[PDB]
Amino acid sequence: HLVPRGSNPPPPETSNPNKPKRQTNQLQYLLRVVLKTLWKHQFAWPFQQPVDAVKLNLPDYYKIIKTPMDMGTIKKRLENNYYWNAQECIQDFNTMFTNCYIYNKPGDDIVLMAEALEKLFLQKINELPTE
Ligand SMILES: CCc1noc2cc(OC)c(NS(=O)(=O)c3ccccc3OC)cc12
């Protein structure tokens, strides 16, 4: 391991009692449809939890990525009704993807994984119900 255990940041928050939130049918769909389908995809597993820079030997990760996001966080945010609207959640997915494409080079296996999840994401977003 390039770096000691403990060198991960605290994960992104999944609750914030003073943050405004609302349940919308669009947020319900984000959980029930979008998250559940990407979650069980064969390429999801690197995205199901915060990047463990220690375990995975990416000691530079949190030098480069200052706004981390992952689908474990997003799943928790949806289940806990953290969001005010669908857009704040979509923002989280886009942040997760962009981080991957910033950190890695095009064609790297991790990027092909993210690209495939992103394709499916965008397909499922396409059918977002009207509020
Ligand atoms: C969002 C998770 C992530 N973003 O960028 C990464 C780069 C990684 O190692 C190259 C790893 N390491 S890994 O063992 O989880 C891994 C996953 C898929 C393909 C290759 C790979 O490690 C070489 C993870 C990420």
PDB file of C-alpha atoms and ligand atoms in Angstrom:
ATOM      1  CA  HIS A   1       0.000   0.000   0.000  1.00  0.00           C
ATOM      2  CA  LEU A   2       1.422   3.430  -1.044  1.00  0.00           C
ATOM      3  CA  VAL A   3      -0.101   5.237   1.921  1.00  0.00           C
ATOM      4  CA  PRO A   4      -1.168   4.422   5.460  1.00  0.00           C
ATOM      5  CA  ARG A   5      -4.647   3.389   6.447  1.00  0.00           C
ATOM      6  CA  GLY A   6      -6.628   6.519   7.593  1.00  0.00           C
ATOM      7  CA  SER A   7      -5.648   8.661   4.610  1.00  0.00           C
ATOM      8  CA  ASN A   8      -9.334   8.740   3.311  1.00  0.00           C
ATOM      9  CA  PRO A   9     -11.507  11.870   3.934  1.00  0.00           C
ATOM     10  CA  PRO A  10     -14.783  11.661   5.815  1.00  0.00           C
ATOM     11  CA  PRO A  11     -17.388  10.545   3.303  1.00  0.00           C
ATOM     12  CA  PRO A  12     -19.924  13.047   1.840  1.00  0.00           C
ATOM     13  CA  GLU A  13     -22.868  13.684   4.191  1.00  0.00           C
ATOM     14  CA  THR A  14     -26.060  11.611   3.716  1.00  0.00           C
ATOM     15  CA  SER A  15     -28.131  13.653   6.112  1.00  0.00           C
ATOM     16  CA  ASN A  16     -28.414  17.280   7.039  1.00  0.00           C
ATOM     17  CA  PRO A  17     -31.476  18.015   9.159  1.00  0.00           C
ATOM     18  CA  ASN A  18     -31.473  21.775   8.406  1.00  0.00           C
ATOM     19  CA  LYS A  19     -31.181  21.226   4.655  1.00  0.00           C
ATOM     20  CA  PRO A  20     -34.463  21.733   2.877  1.00  0.00           C
ATOM     21  CA  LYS A  21     -35.909  18.544   1.236  1.00  0.00           C
ATOM     22  CA  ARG A  22     -39.035  17.228  -0.535  1.00  0.00           C
ATOM     23  CA  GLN A  23     -40.264  13.837  -1.773  1.00  0.00           C
ATOM     24  CA  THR A  24     -41.190  14.143  -5.436  1.00  0.00           C
ATOM     25  CA  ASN A  25     -42.304  11.412  -7.774  1.00  0.00           C
ATOM     26  CA  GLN A  26     -39.096  12.221  -9.762  1.00  0.00           C
ATOM     27  CA  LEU A  27     -36.866  11.635  -6.830  1.00  0.00           C
ATOM     28  CA  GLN A  28     -38.828   8.390  -6.137  1.00  0.00           C
ATOM     29  CA  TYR A  29     -38.103   7.315  -9.704  1.00  0.00           C
ATOM     30  CA  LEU A  30     -34.412   8.191  -9.308  1.00  0.00           C
ATOM     31  CA  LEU A  31     -34.261   5.698  -6.506  1.00  0.00           C
ATOM     32  CA  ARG A  32     -36.708   3.005  -7.670  1.00  0.00           C
ATOM     33  CA  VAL A  33     -35.586   2.991 -11.301  1.00  0.00           C
ATOM     34  CA  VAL A  34     -32.367   4.863 -12.041  1.00  0.00           C
ATOM     35  CA  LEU A  35     -30.279   3.960  -8.975  1.00  0.00           C
ATOM     36  CA  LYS A  36     -31.610   0.402  -8.673  1.00  0.00           C
ATOM     37  CA  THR A  37     -30.803  -0.431 -12.308  1.00  0.00           C
ATOM     38  CA  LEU A  38     -27.269   1.057 -12.288  1.00  0.00           C
ATOM     39  CA  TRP A  39     -26.643  -0.457  -8.899  1.00  0.00           C
ATOM     40  CA  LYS A  40     -26.999  -4.031 -10.049  1.00  0.00           C
ATOM     41  CA  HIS A  41     -25.051  -3.548 -13.253  1.00  0.00           C
ATOM     42  CA  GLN A  42     -21.831  -5.638 -13.504  1.00  0.00           C
ATOM     43  CA  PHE A  43     -19.773  -2.321 -13.730  1.00  0.00           C
ATOM     44  CA  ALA A  44     -21.349  -0.680 -10.671  1.00  0.00           C
ATOM     45  CA  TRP A  45     -19.127  -2.160  -8.003  1.00  0.00           C
ATOM     46  CA  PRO A  46     -16.350   0.510  -8.072  1.00  0.00           C
ATOM     47  CA  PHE A  47     -19.060   3.191  -7.761  1.00  0.00           C
ATOM     48  CA  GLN A  48     -20.971   1.640  -4.807  1.00  0.00           C
ATOM     49  CA  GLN A  49     -18.979   3.355  -2.093  1.00  0.00           C
ATOM     50  CA  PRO A  50     -16.588   6.210  -1.636  1.00  0.00           C
ATOM     51  CA  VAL A  51     -13.203   5.804  -3.298  1.00  0.00           C
ATOM     52  CA  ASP A  52     -10.962   4.026  -0.747  1.00  0.00           C
ATOM     53  CA  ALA A  53      -7.689   5.582  -1.777  1.00  0.00           C
ATOM     54  CA  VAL A  54      -5.784   3.489   0.737  1.00  0.00           C
ATOM     55  CA  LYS A  55      -7.134   0.033  -0.226  1.00  0.00           C
ATOM     56  CA  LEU A  56      -6.940   0.813  -3.988  1.00  0.00           C
ATOM     57  CA  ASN A  57      -3.534   2.550  -3.985  1.00  0.00           C
ATOM     58  CA  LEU A  58      -4.714   5.820  -5.383  1.00  0.00           C
ATOM     59  CA  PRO A  59      -2.804   7.960  -2.919  1.00  0.00           C
ATOM     60  CA  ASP A  60      -3.171  10.968  -5.256  1.00  0.00           C
ATOM     61  CA  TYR A  61      -6.931  10.618  -5.588  1.00  0.00           C
ATOM     62  CA  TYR A  62      -8.018  13.234  -2.996  1.00  0.00           C
ATOM     63  CA  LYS A  63      -5.159  15.560  -4.153  1.00  0.00           C
ATOM     64  CA  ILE A  64      -6.984  15.702  -7.512  1.00  0.00           C
ATOM     65  CA  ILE A  65     -10.681  15.088  -6.648  1.00  0.00           C
ATOM     66  CA  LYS A  66     -11.933  17.685  -4.105  1.00  0.00           C
ATOM     67  CA  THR A  67     -15.702  16.979  -4.670  1.00  0.00           C
ATOM     68  CA  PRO A  68     -15.943  13.210  -4.325  1.00  0.00           C
ATOM     69  CA  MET A  69     -19.226  11.373  -5.026  1.00  0.00           C
ATOM     70  CA  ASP A  70     -20.326   7.783  -5.360  1.00  0.00           C
ATOM     71  CA  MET A  71     -23.534   5.818  -5.750  1.00  0.00           C
ATOM     72  CA  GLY A  72     -23.461   4.541  -2.187  1.00  0.00           C
ATOM     73  CA  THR A  73     -23.747   8.153  -1.044  1.00  0.00           C
ATOM     74  CA  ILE A  74     -26.400   8.909  -3.613  1.00  0.00           C
ATOM     75  CA  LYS A  75     -28.404   5.730  -2.582  1.00  0.00           C
ATOM     76  CA  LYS A  76     -28.304   6.852   1.051  1.00  0.00           C
ATOM     77  CA  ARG A  77     -29.320  10.419   0.088  1.00  0.00           C
ATOM     78  CA  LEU A  78     -32.315   9.087  -1.813  1.00  0.00           C
ATOM     79  CA  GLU A  79     -33.322   6.678   0.937  1.00  0.00           C
ATOM     80  CA  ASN A  80     -33.003   9.382   3.559  1.00  0.00           C
ATOM     81  CA  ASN A  81     -34.930  11.989   1.464  1.00  0.00           C
ATOM     82  CA  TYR A  82     -31.850  14.346   1.440  1.00  0.00           C
ATOM     83  CA  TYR A  83     -32.739  16.138  -1.806  1.00  0.00           C
ATOM     84  CA  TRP A  84     -34.960  19.086  -2.534  1.00  0.00           C
ATOM     85  CA  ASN A  85     -35.372  18.116  -6.248  1.00  0.00           C
ATOM     86  CA  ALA A  86     -34.325  15.651  -8.928  1.00  0.00           C
ATOM     87  CA  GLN A  87     -31.708  18.086 -10.283  1.00  0.00           C
ATOM     88  CA  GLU A  88     -29.637  18.064  -7.097  1.00  0.00           C
ATOM     89  CA  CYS A  89     -29.489  14.268  -7.395  1.00  0.00           C
ATOM     90  CA  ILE A  90     -28.611  14.309 -11.093  1.00  0.00           C
ATOM     91  CA  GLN A  91     -25.889  16.747 -10.125  1.00  0.00           C
ATOM     92  CA  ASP A  92     -24.452  14.066  -7.807  1.00  0.00           C
ATOM     93  CA  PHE A  93     -24.386  11.466 -10.591  1.00  0.00           C
ATOM     94  CA  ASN A  94     -22.644  13.887 -12.941  1.00  0.00           C
ATOM     95  CA  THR A  95     -20.106  14.744 -10.352  1.00  0.00           C
ATOM     96  CA  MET A  96     -19.367  11.011  -9.866  1.00  0.00           C
ATOM     97  CA  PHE A  97     -18.860  10.498 -13.578  1.00  0.00           C
ATOM     98  CA  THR A  98     -16.814  13.603 -14.167  1.00  0.00           C
ATOM     99  CA  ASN A  99     -14.486  12.711 -11.275  1.00  0.00           C
ATOM    100  CA  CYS A 100     -13.752   9.394 -12.960  1.00  0.00           C
ATOM    101  CA  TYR A 101     -12.959  11.011 -16.342  1.00  0.00           C
ATOM    102  CA  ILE A 102     -10.761  13.647 -14.678  1.00  0.00           C
ATOM    103  CA  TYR A 103      -8.754  11.198 -12.667  1.00  0.00           C
ATOM    104  CA  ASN A 104      -8.216   8.449 -15.260  1.00  0.00           C
ATOM    105  CA  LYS A 105      -7.262   8.397 -18.953  1.00  0.00           C
ATOM    106  CA  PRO A 106      -9.625   7.649 -21.763  1.00  0.00           C
ATOM    107  CA  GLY A 107      -9.932   3.970 -22.530  1.00  0.00           C
ATOM    108  CA  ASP A 108      -8.791   2.834 -19.019  1.00  0.00           C
ATOM    109  CA  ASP A 109     -11.068   0.051 -17.772  1.00  0.00           C
ATOM    110  CA  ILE A 110     -12.519   2.236 -14.995  1.00  0.00           C
ATOM    111  CA  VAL A 111     -13.492   4.878 -17.608  1.00  0.00           C
ATOM    112  CA  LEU A 112     -15.190   2.286 -19.843  1.00  0.00           C
ATOM    113  CA  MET A 113     -17.092   1.229 -16.751  1.00  0.00           C
ATOM    114  CA  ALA A 114     -18.199   4.799 -15.996  1.00  0.00           C
ATOM    115  CA  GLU A 115     -19.072   5.409 -19.695  1.00  0.00           C
ATOM    116  CA  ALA A 116     -21.314   2.401 -19.780  1.00  0.00           C
ATOM    117  CA  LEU A 117     -23.078   3.365 -16.506  1.00  0.00           C
ATOM    118  CA  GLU A 118     -23.422   6.901 -17.762  1.00  0.00           C
ATOM    119  CA  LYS A 119     -25.020   5.700 -21.038  1.00  0.00           C
ATOM    120  CA  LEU A 120     -27.592   3.720 -19.091  1.00  0.00           C
ATOM    121  CA  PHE A 121     -28.071   6.638 -16.610  1.00  0.00           C
ATOM    122  CA  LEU A 122     -28.819   9.004 -19.450  1.00  0.00           C
ATOM    123  CA  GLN A 123     -31.222   6.537 -21.026  1.00  0.00           C
ATOM    124  CA  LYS A 124     -33.146   6.182 -17.737  1.00  0.00           C
ATOM    125  CA  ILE A 125     -33.120   9.980 -17.155  1.00  0.00           C
ATOM    126  CA  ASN A 126     -34.617  10.373 -20.519  1.00  0.00           C
ATOM    127  CA  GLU A 127     -37.794   8.746 -19.124  1.00  0.00           C
ATOM    128  CA  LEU A 128     -37.931  10.883 -15.933  1.00  0.00           C
ATOM    129  CA  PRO A 129     -41.635  11.417 -15.107  1.00  0.00           C
ATOM    130  CA  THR A 130     -43.225  14.818 -15.154  1.00  0.00           C
ATOM    131  CA  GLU A 131     -43.408  16.413 -11.725  1.00  0.00           C
TER     132      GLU A 131
HETATM  133  C1  LIG B   1     -14.681   5.573  -8.852  1.00  0.00           C
HETATM  134  C2  LIG B   1     -13.660   4.447  -8.530  1.00  0.00           C
HETATM  135  C3  LIG B   1     -12.411   4.785  -9.280  1.00  0.00           C
HETATM  136  N1  LIG B   1     -12.282   5.951  -9.918  1.00  0.00           N
HETATM  137  O1  LIG B   1     -10.964   5.934 -10.524  1.00  0.00           O
HETATM  138  C4  LIG B   1     -10.420   4.741 -10.098  1.00  0.00           C
HETATM  139  C5  LIG B   1      -9.241   4.212 -10.420  1.00  0.00           C
HETATM  140  C6  LIG B   1      -8.902   2.978  -9.918  1.00  0.00           C
HETATM  141  O2  LIG B   1      -7.673   2.372 -10.130  1.00  0.00           O
HETATM  142  C7  LIG B   1      -7.088   2.684 -11.381  1.00  0.00           C
HETATM  143  C8  LIG B   1      -9.757   2.252  -9.080  1.00  0.00           C
HETATM  144  N2  LIG B   1      -9.229   1.055  -8.617  1.00  0.00           N
HETATM  145  S1  LIG B   1     -10.187  -0.353  -8.633  1.00  0.00           S
HETATM  146  O3  LIG B   1      -9.502  -1.540  -8.062  1.00  0.00           O
HETATM  147  O4  LIG B   1     -11.461  -0.143  -7.883  1.00  0.00           O
HETATM  148  C9  LIG B   1     -10.484  -0.675 -10.355  1.00  0.00           C
HETATM  149  C10 LIG B   1     -11.801  -0.763 -10.795  1.00  0.00           C
HETATM  150  C11 LIG B   1     -12.076  -1.046 -12.123  1.00  0.00           C
HETATM  151  C12 LIG B   1     -11.062  -1.156 -13.058  1.00  0.00           C
HETATM  152  C13 LIG B   1      -9.742  -1.060 -12.622  1.00  0.00           C
HETATM  153  C14 LIG B   1      -9.436  -0.832 -11.251  1.00  0.00           C
HETATM  154  O5  LIG B   1      -8.152  -0.796 -10.675  1.00  0.00           O
HETATM  155  C15 LIG B   1      -6.955  -0.923 -11.472  1.00  0.00           C
HETATM  156  C16 LIG B   1     -10.999   2.802  -8.808  1.00  0.00           C
HETATM  157  C17 LIG B   1     -11.307   4.030  -9.346  1.00  0.00           C
END
